[PDB]
């Protein structure tokens with residue numbers, strides 16, 4: 001019995017969460033983004049060749065992907081293709097990866113619905129326009145639906161659902177993405193993540209997803225800051241950390257070891273998994289990147305040297321798009337030899353070293369009851385116009401749900417919308433939801449503001 005966000009996950013899925021946690025401290029799986037769809041020594045990709053495979057002799061233990069594929073921006077996705085065809089290619093690649101014997105992970109550099117721009121376009125107030133009751137909520141819904149398609153298409157020839165570690169809205173601590181810190185409060189972010197998990201799990205029925213959350217990096221091991229964004233235990237399976245450096249300095253390494261041992265502790269206390277979700281030399285290790293001396297081994301040495309910092313399930317460096325930008329060395333790059341040294345290290349696990357990750361027999365503890373106010377989210381500013389207060393109570397049968405706007409200015413009696421939320425009209429500081437549930441009385445409080 002293990003704690004998994006989706007209490008109804010498939011056998012293999014639960015098996016993976018079980019594997020990923022047991023592996024911590026024993027060996028770290030090396031992952032590579034677009035490892036068989038983007039290469040420099042492979043030639044035209046097709047989902048079977050990989051630069052890692054060509055320089056190290058084995059595929060990474062983890063294959064990384066991104067929703068950009070569906071968008072048609074990252075192969076095998078193609079601009080021409082309809083999203084429905086790209087989804088088919090993505091699933092095919094996910095199949096070949098699993099066939100190779102690897103573990104699949106997926107990130108989402110979601111397009112800026114509001115402006116038509118990319119994830120790097122941080123204008124349009126897209127974060128808030130996408131949240132429950134948002135002016136572009138439907139767009140996000142539509143996007144998540146395509147993600148549900150992908151979840152379902154990811155099956156073995158026997159029809160068995162391939163487990164996928166979903167890592168949505170990453171690095172929100174920074175502001176280089178429209179869903180970052182400068183565009184929403186910790187609370188607004190949380191509702192964004194939570195609605196994501198609930199829509200896919202509860203509304204779409206996905207059952208082969210382990211949800212991952214990684215705010216960023218460079219926390220100096222500060223639990224407080226790190227967690228400020230945490231969606232909460234009933235929404236996260238994997239606690240991540242994203243950190244790139246290009247100095248190999250001891251200072252860098254010290255900080256990295258601090259963040260790694262932190263997430264590891266939080267993970268242990270919470271009975272969840274922790275991993276180095278993203279890592280690598282800044283700007284890559286190619287033409288436009290940098291070749292810090294023995295960077296790869298210096299980092300491994302740093303990770304192993306610490307008993308706690310090493311209790312992280314995997315570490316994935318980024319894509320090998322081209323010469324200027326690629327994170328895994330190829331003939332000609334200075335770090336090529338060091339990266340091989342790192343691969344040959346007994347502590348780094350690769351595809352062929354992965355065994356007993358899906359055939360395990362584990363039970364998912366019962367989903368824990370939870371209740372949050374989807375709107376208005378915590379730390380959000382409320383408009384004078386009438387708005388709908390929506391509460392979500394999960395993991396138990398709800399008899400009733402009440403809300404109290406204090407400052408007590410109002411008292412609302414909510415009603416289930418038959419699909420996800422308990423709602424009610426509110427024509428405007430403290431919104432407190434109380435739900436009389438089968439698991440007892442659950443209450444929650446969001447704090448907002450008028451204009």
Ligand SMILES: OC[C@H]1O[C@@H](O[C@H]2[C@H](O)[C@H](O)[C@H](O[C@H]3[C@H](O)[C@H](O)[C@H](O)O[C@@H]3CO)O[C@@H]2CO)[C@@H](O)[C@@H](O)[C@@H]1O
Pocket residue numbers: 066068073074075109318319321325
């Ligand atoms: O423009 C045509 C060119 O597009 C390439 O694919 C792009 C992606 O569409 C996307 O822009 C991606 O963004 C990267 C970003 O550059 C950086 O690496 C960041 O760390 O991660 C994001 C996404 O993971 O960059 C790639 C390539 O740079 C590809 O389809 C080319 O074949 C095509 O000609």
Ligand SMILES: C[As](C)(=O)[O-]
Pocket residue numbers: 107171242278318
């Ligand atoms: C490589 As990135 C933009 O996901 O940190």
